[PDB]
Design a protein around this ligand. Structure first.
Ligand SMILES: [Mg+2]
Ligand SMILES: [Mg+2]
Ligand SMILES: [Mg+2]
Ligand SMILES: [Mg+2]
Ligand SMILES: [Mg+2]
Ligand SMILES: [Mg+2]
Ligand SMILES: [Mg+2]
Ligand SMILES: [Mg+2]
Ligand SMILES: [Mg+2]
Lengths: 144, 314, 190, 225, 142, 81, 101
RNA sequence: ACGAGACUCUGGCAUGCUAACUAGUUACGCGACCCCCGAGCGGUCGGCGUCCCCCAACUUCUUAGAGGGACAAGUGGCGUU
RNA sequence: GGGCACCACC
């Protein structure tokens, strides 16, 4: 009876993992987090000031599900639609300097490591942490 | 003085029932081939609601299934189809154990030997092929077997020299000698194409029929024409009673029983009550088989049904 | 087992009081489904849409205008919320409310036009039951749509109010007014 | 390096098209019919189909020895990989290109349009074709242009069988007062072999065989042999 | 304990879902995730319909794992339903009697025929002169 | 519409005239005989011809047809008349 | 003994399949081990153009299409036998490439 | 007789055939993680072997060849039947 | 006076 990541709801898992990363306090946060927007198709900066932890949690979860993703892959993952005035909308990618710093910060926690083929993947410690978080989420969901 | 009464009906098919096979080893099971590309194994309950229910469906044929025959021990089954291939199935698991390839047209008839070591098959390719169990065509016959399609091929279950009898759409009944595979006898008496040929359990008499509607009885060991019995429109199936010395012919709307000693009709089997449906043609009787017990006839019809007739003695 | 719409609204207690419309409203046992979403081919043949469940017909007719074409998940959610609101407001089965609203909203006598492009003259005719159901659904959806526009009020609340008023027979609803005016003009064109 | 398969096939097609155009312009006078390129890793062979090979060969083979030179100069592949051959067409009456050239040169010599067109039509029909059509368009008589049409036999227009049952040729001839246009269509006969016609029949032609004589049976006879 | 299993597929416009059904205890998963975690959850009942119609008793002896690919979200859900139903029917046909298969097939077909028979509809090609297959560009006079 | 062009009707009538003995009321046996005797370069055309042959055979069994006449039918009508 | 791959590229399928069958039969007559022929996905080149040489009339378009078919055959054998069987294989319209991996 | 139809390409069906490390599935080994209250013939894995000395089978899913399949054929009405 | 067509209407 062991809970894995795929068993629980993904949004609640992301919330719980972001809370765990914030409470840990060992994550490295850039200085410009409060003055930048996450992509060129965004109009405003993110509403949540603790958005870096949420993005790090999402990146860790994605590396859990599909390993070997680089900066370009993460940039494509978080890209979205761009509306440009009186012209038709088009797909647009995210900011590379945010994805790169999220990956570097996760590597600083010994949760993400360089992949032999290329890109980054999860360490056994990161997988253990994610499975523990999934178990906590499942227990909280069942108890209430 | 026996009356044949309809006992029940088996409904599992979606197409014309084409052949019915029985076996002495297992009286409680029947095997029926049909035009829905499926061979149904029927388990007989003899209950109130249903005389029998389907047990397993053998489905590996892409086209219609024409003929089906069980082995001596009732453990394997053989089948020919319109896709040009023969299939050998294990009845225990219902899985195809062997496939016979080599015919370029529809395989109309297939027959097992008396020892289950030789297999014969006639095709619309005007070709008769002889195979072994492993699936290798040991001998094909292009020696002027027939100028037209080969309808039925059967073995002779007699202690004497093994014989294979075939009927053609060229109005001919040919008799070939086994283990040498040479033409031994020709029979030219019919006016029209032939459908079925059968052999008596003694191995002495054979019956042939077709569109002309006359069942002609020939002598196998001597090689002469013996008798001719008039019947209905088209003779689809001919069978011999294993223990009663009878000849049962399957005509379109009805089934006729002849006593070979008296040449007198014993019974005619047909039923339809609805007056509105009289305009439409009654379903034809395609296939015919005797249970080894000798008391039940199984008749397969165009109506996608299998009807059982029970003998009542008086 | 028992099949309840959205898992909580049963169909056994619902009954249709109009003999004419019994054959064209599909709410009963063999038409009981869990969701108003089946991806069926009901437009392939004539009269086949009488076999489509009436909740799914409302859902199909709620995907207007062109800015809402094809968005059927949002429409299913809207119908679900509207049924919840109807149950809270009235206290009865929202399927019965929908059936009553459709029965009351369908015009019974119409007027057919013979018009030279400017001037038009008309003659009173009867309406088949299928057209009654179609026009009732169209009127209800149009009323809810016009109520929700440029107003701080959810589309589900407006749909619930329209359905409740139509089932009650009140003239506060768009469909009742439209039916009354159509029947008045038909009466005057006899 | 190497190029992709798409580019390779398009390049082969373009080379064949340019070779055909050059050979047409060079050998129109000799009844040039077609060109067939067979590519072998040893040498690339080119077969020239024309009505008469004597003019293509020239005296002592000079002219053909010239052509295989310029081709090598044009497309640039190395010497010794080029070899041209001349083969006469099996039946010249069933080729629309050769008939169009023949009509063009008859008109160029000053013959009457009607006489030459009827002669070409008669030759095509005598060769064994199902049918033929010849259209000549231009300033045949006067300042106003018109079109003359000569048809004979059968002819199909629509469908897929037009692709392999009809042979078409369009040509231009420059006369003193301007250009005339020539169109020739020939409908090939059905041939079980692929020599002078399509192998497959027309889709809607059904040939029902005559049944053979059968002896009426009278008495059951058993024959043993 | 013989190794008895069946793999059956189901299709929607471009979506294909293949279900592997073997002897087991009652596990049913899609891409490794439970049935209740598949999105969108608006159409969750469409995914639970075969289980609700047949009950957990008939699924209590098999493990089913589905792999989905292609199409959109709704098409993938409708493919998963059909794959589950057809896989259960094919398993009952081979490793149980024909009567149970007949009962299950009748129950499934009465509720919805698309649980066992695929929908042939596919997108129609665009023709030049208009935005799509049927629509044409706006014509003008004078 | 499902009207048959004169090609199918002519081919079916000629087949019934020449091979009345070999035909019957079964579409599949008829379509197997047609490819045996006739040369149809299309599968759809052969199916159409066989499907009209079956309809014509049923009509003949019901009674005389305005068009083709079978030698056996003529000889039988001689005995009838 | 080499692992040798034969790649066949053609524009029509009848000639390509005839050549593939000839190669398979020839190789198997020498009691050799053959894998394939494995058929790659067909390639479809498309060119859509306007019919009119000018810009007048209804806007009508021609859709020209070219299809390329590709086959693979694997053989465990020495070079000499492969060339023996390949020499016959020369066919008009089929490009045959022999490589040693 | 031409045109229309027929014809060619295309989209739907095949657990039947042919055969694939430039497509996969399943199974079996190795490994990572979770549950020591059920630790297991347990769950997740787009993590690594299984063709190339020897270390698995098979085409359901993917590709593309050969064939099948539908004809207003079956039933009931309406039609000059 | 009839027949047809969402480049006609309903
Ligand atoms: Mg995105
Ligand atoms: Mg904008
Ligand atoms: Mg509002
Ligand atoms: Mg034509
Ligand atoms: Mg046409
Ligand atoms: Mg589209
Ligand atoms: Mg569109
Ligand atoms: Mg396959
Ligand atoms: Mg309008």
């Amino acid at each position: 009876p062991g809970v894995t990541v795929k068993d629980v709801n993904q949004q609640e898992f992301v919330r719980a993992l972001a809370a765990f990363l914030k409470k840990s306090g060992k994550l490295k946060v850039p200085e410009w987090v409060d003055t930048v927007k996450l992509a060129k198709h965004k109009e405003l900066a993110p509403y949540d000031e603790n958005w870096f932890y949420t993005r790090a949690a999402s990146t860790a979860r994605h590396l859990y599900l599909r390993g070997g993703a680089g900066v370009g892959s993460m940039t494509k993952i978080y890209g979205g639609r761009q509306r440009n005035g009186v012209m038709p909308s088009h797909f647009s990618r995210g900011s590379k300097s945010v994805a790169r710093r999220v990956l570097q910060a996760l590597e600083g926690l010994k949760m993400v490591e360089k992949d032999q083929d290329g890109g980054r993947k999860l360490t056994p410690q990161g997988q253990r942490d994610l499975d523990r978080i999934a178990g906590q989420v499942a227990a909280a969901n069942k108890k209430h | 003085t026996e009356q044949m009464t309809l006992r029940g009906t088996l409904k599992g098919h979606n197409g014309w029932v084409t052949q019915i096979a029985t076996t002495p080893q297992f009286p409680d099971m029947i095997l029926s081939a049909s035009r829905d590309k499926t061979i149904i194994m029927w388990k007989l309950t003899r209950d109130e609601t249903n005389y029998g229910i389907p047990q397993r469906a053998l489905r590996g044929h892409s086209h219609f299934v024409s003929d089906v025959v069980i082995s001596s021990d009732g453990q394997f089954a053989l089948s020919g189809s319109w896709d040009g291939t023969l299939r050998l199935w294990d009845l225990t698991t219902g899985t195809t154990t062997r496939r016979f390839v080599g015919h370029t047209k529809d395989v109309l008839s297939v027959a097992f030997s008396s020892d289950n070591r030789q297999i014969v098959s006639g095709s619309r390719d005007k070709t008769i092929k002889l195979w072994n169990t492993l699936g290798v065509c040991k001998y094909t016959v292009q020696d002027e077997s027939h100028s037209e399609w080969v309808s039925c091929v059967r073995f002779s279950p007699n202690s004497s020299n093994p014989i294979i009898v075939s009927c053609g759409w060229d109005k001919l009944v040919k008799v070939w000698n086994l283990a040498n595979c040479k033409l031994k006898t020709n029979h030219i008496g019919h006016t029209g194409y032939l459908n079925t040929v059968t052999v008596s359990p003694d191995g002495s008499l054979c019956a042939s029929g077709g569109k002309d509607g006359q069942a002609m009885l020939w002598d196998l060991n001597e090689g002469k024409h013996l008798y001719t019995l008039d019947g209905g429109d088209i003779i689809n199936a001919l069978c011999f009673s294993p223990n009663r010395y009878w000849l049962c012919a399957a005509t379109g709307p009805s089934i006729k029983i002849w006593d070979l000693e008296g040449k007198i009709i014993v019974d005619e089997l047909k039923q339809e009550v609805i007056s509105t449906s009289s305009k439409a043609e009654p379903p034809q009787c395609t296939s015919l088989a005797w249970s080894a017990d000798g008391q039940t006839l199984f008749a397969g019809y165009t109506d996608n049904l299998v009807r059982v007739w029970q003998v009542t003695i008086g | 087992p028992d099949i309840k719409l959205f898992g909580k609204w049963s169909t056994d207690d619902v009954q249709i009081n109009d003999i004419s419309l019994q054959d064209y409203i599909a709410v009963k046992e063999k038409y009981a489904k869990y969701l108003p979403h089946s991806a069926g081919r009901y437009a392939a043949k004539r009269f086949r849409k009488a076999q489509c469940p009436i909740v799914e017909r409302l859902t199909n007719s709620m995907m207007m205008h062109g800015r809402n074409n094809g968005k059927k998940l949002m429409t299913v959610r809207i119908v679900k919320h509207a049924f919840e609101i109807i149950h809270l407001l009235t206290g009865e089965n929202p399927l019965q409310v929908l059936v009553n609203a459709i029965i009351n909203s369908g015009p019974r006598e119409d007027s057919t036009r013979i018009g030279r492009a400017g001037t038009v003259r008309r003659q009173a005719v009867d309406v088949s039951p299928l057209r009654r159901v179609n026009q009732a659904i169209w009127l209800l959806c149009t009323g809810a749509r016009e109520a929700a526009f440029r107003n701080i009020k959810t589309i589900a609340e407006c749909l619930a109010d329209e359905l409740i008023n139509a089932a009650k027979g009140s003239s506060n609803s768009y469909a009742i007014k439209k039916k009354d005016e159509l029947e008045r003009v038909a009466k005057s064109n006899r | 390096v190497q190029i992709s398969k798409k580019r390779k096939f398009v390049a082969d097609g373009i080379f064949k098209a340019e070779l055909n155009e050059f050979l047409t312009r060079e050998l129109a006078e000799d009844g040039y019919s077609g060109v067939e390129v067979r590519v072998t890793p040893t040498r690339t062979e080119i077969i020239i189909l024309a009505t008469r090979t004597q003019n293509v060969l020239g005296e002592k083979g000079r002219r053909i020895r010239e052509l295989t030179a310029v081709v090598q100069k044009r497309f640039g592949f190395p010497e010794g990989s080029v070899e041209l051959y001349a083969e006469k067409v099996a039946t010249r009456g069933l080729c629309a290109i050769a008939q169009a050239e023949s009509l063009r040169y008859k008109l160029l010599g000053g013959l009457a349009v009607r006489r030459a067109c009827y002669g070409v039509l008669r030759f095509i029909m005598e060769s064994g074709a199902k049918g033929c059509e010849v259209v000549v368009s231009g300033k045949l008589r006067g300042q106003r242009a018109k079109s003359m049409k000569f048809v004979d036999g059968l002819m199909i227009h629509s469908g897929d069988p037009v692709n392999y049952y009809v042979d078409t040729a369009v040509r231009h001839v420059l006369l003193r007062q301007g250009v005339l246009g020539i169109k020739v269509k020939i409908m090939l006969p059905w041939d079980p072999t692929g020599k002078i016609g399509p192998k497959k029949p027309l889709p809607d032609h059904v040939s029902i065989v005559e049944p053979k004589d059968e002896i009426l049976p009278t008495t059951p006879i058993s024959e043993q042999k | 304990g013989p190794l008895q299993s069946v793999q059956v597929f189901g299709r929607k416009k471009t979506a294909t879902a293949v279900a592997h059904c073997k002897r087991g205890n009652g596990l049913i998963k899609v891409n490794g995730r439970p049935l209740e975690m598949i999105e969108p959850r608006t159409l969750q009942y469409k995914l639970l319909e075969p289980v609700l119609l047949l009950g957990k008793e008939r699924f209590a002896g098999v493990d089913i794992r589905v792999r989905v690919k292609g199409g959109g979200h709704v098409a993938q859900i409708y493919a998963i339903r059909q794959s589950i139903s057809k896989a259960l029917v094919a398993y009952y046909q081979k490793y149980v009697d024909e009567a149970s298969k007949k009962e299950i097939k009748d129950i499934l077909i009465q509720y919805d025929r698309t649980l066992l028979v695929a929908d042939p509809r596919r997108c129609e090609s665009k023709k030049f002169g208009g935005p799509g297959a049927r629509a044409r560009y706006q014509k003008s006079y004078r | 519409g499902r009207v048959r062009t004169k090609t199918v009707k002519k081919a079916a009538r000629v087949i019934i005239e020449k091979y009345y003995t070999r035909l019957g009321n079964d579409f599949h046996t008829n379509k197997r005989v047609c490819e045996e005797i006739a040369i149809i370069p299309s599968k759809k055309l052969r199916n159409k011809i066989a499907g009209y042959v079956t309809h014509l055979m049923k009509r003949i069994q019901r009674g005389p047809v305005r068009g083709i006449s079978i030698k056996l039918q003529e000889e039988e009508r001689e005995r009838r008349d | 003994i080499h692992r040798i791959r034969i790649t066949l590229t053609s524009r029509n399928v009848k000639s390509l399949e005839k050549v593939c069958a000839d190669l398979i039969r020839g190789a198997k007559e020498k009691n050799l081990k053959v894998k394939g022929p494995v058929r790659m996905p067909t390639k479809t080149l498309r060119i859509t153009t306007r019919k009119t040489p000018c810009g007048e009339g209804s806007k009508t378009w021609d859709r020209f299409q070219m299809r390329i078919h590709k086959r693979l055959i694997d053989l465990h054998s020495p070079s000499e036998i492969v060339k023996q069987i390949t020499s016959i294989s020369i066919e008009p319209g089929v490009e045959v490439e022999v490589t040693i991996a």
